[PDB]
Design a protein around this ligand. Sequence first.
Ligand SMILES: Nc1nc2c(ncn2[C@@H]2O[C@H](COP(=O)(O)OP(=O)(O)OP(=O)(O)O)[C@@H](O)[C@H]2O)c(=O)[nH]1
Ligand code: NI
Length: 462
Amino acid sequence: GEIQWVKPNKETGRLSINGPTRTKLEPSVFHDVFEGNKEPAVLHSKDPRLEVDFEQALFSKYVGNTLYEPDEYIKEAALHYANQLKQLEINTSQMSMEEACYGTENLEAIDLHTSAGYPYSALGIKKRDILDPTTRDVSKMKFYMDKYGLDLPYSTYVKDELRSIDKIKKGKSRLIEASSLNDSVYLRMAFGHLYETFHANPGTITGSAVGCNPDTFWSKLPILLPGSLFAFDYSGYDASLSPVWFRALELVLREIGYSEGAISLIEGINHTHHVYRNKTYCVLGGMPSGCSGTSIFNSMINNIIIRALLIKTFKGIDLDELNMVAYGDDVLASYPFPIDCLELAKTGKEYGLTMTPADKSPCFNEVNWDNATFLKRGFLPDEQFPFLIHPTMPMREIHESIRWTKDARNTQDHVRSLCLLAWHNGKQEYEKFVSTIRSVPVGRALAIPNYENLRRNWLELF
Ligand SMILES: Nc1nc2c(ncn2[C@@H]2O[C@H](COP(=O)(O)OP(=O)(O)OP(=O)(O)O)[C@@H](O)[C@H]2O)c(=O)[nH]1
Ligand code: NI
């Protein structure tokens, strides 16, 4: 992706969003009980921890666009993926406005907590004002759809979250780029059934893990990905995608039966306008980031990418023998025999993608189940029931999180949350964690879940 121009809102007539942008994160009662070193991300240009220009650090993610037009490899990759999806029988007919807004069994209601985007956030109009789950009324949504139209700018703001110290000095905060509610509804009307089938079918047919429940999905992965694993970390995947990947996605959507009306919506994600503070700017390439409404298309594009890199790097590679699941930039894949990840990463570089095998430096200790990572979690076979796989969030992450809170009233819920994640690391790790919570009088007053009970509830899921 690449920014084309930047203009003040005075010029473009776009509505600004306000200040103040101080963090809501504060040191919790555990900040000094547990160890970590992340702090709240930089939120504003005059933050005292900044060592660089903020605005320019924020937009440096846009590394440019390499290709605009699918070559033969990308073309072949798109076809393979699209053929594979045919077995799912995705319903390409429009989804009703009611279902797009309010949900079906395989699609969640538009979240009534997050902002409604442009112009609603700037006008003070909330989702709550438009949408009622008790009524499932769409007449008010239609009213605002007619009022503001489609294809609105992406109201863009800095994510309030913990970051490494290096990310803070270097101003590398992350942005949330919210589409207008109007455009989410219309996108969801166009591709809602596809979203339903992807949520219902996490796995290797869809090539997708979006919406999965790691508690149970982890046990399936070793079966769905036999042979030898490969996996990378992208740097700045979303923003590094050039328009070519959007063209390839269109090829996939066309191959599986989409009308040109539906398909033309992709260009509105490839070429977008953003309003950040009081400037508006045009981005070409790059998946808009921070939702959710974008996860499936990032994941689909990743299935295309991996395929294209595979056939362009290695001759006579058989794509039928590839197994992969993707969740946004995050990918876990396997092939009948080892793959030179370094050579993949150099092909990636040709397409403007930055890739690094997840490890130290540089490449692949095979990457097998003991050190594999997906959605941040490792893979730990149960001690008693090895066919059951625990998803393990590293305690280091849990340690970072507990030390901060956005609301002091939430100590109980925040701690229970972390315990639900921690016990998967084993009895001994869990007990050490609980005992540290309990080294402090507030900790002792909390309701903390019992290990073997947590485990028995987990066994019931199988
Ligand atoms: N901007 C943004 N990115 C998100 C968000 N949620 C998930 N992501 C993903 O996070 C990536 C940015 O992650 P960072 O922690 O800044 O860095 P990175 O891309 O992992 O690469 P490194 O710099 O090597 O650490 C994007 O490319 C997205 O795929 C979000 O809310 N906003
Ligand atoms: Ni533009």
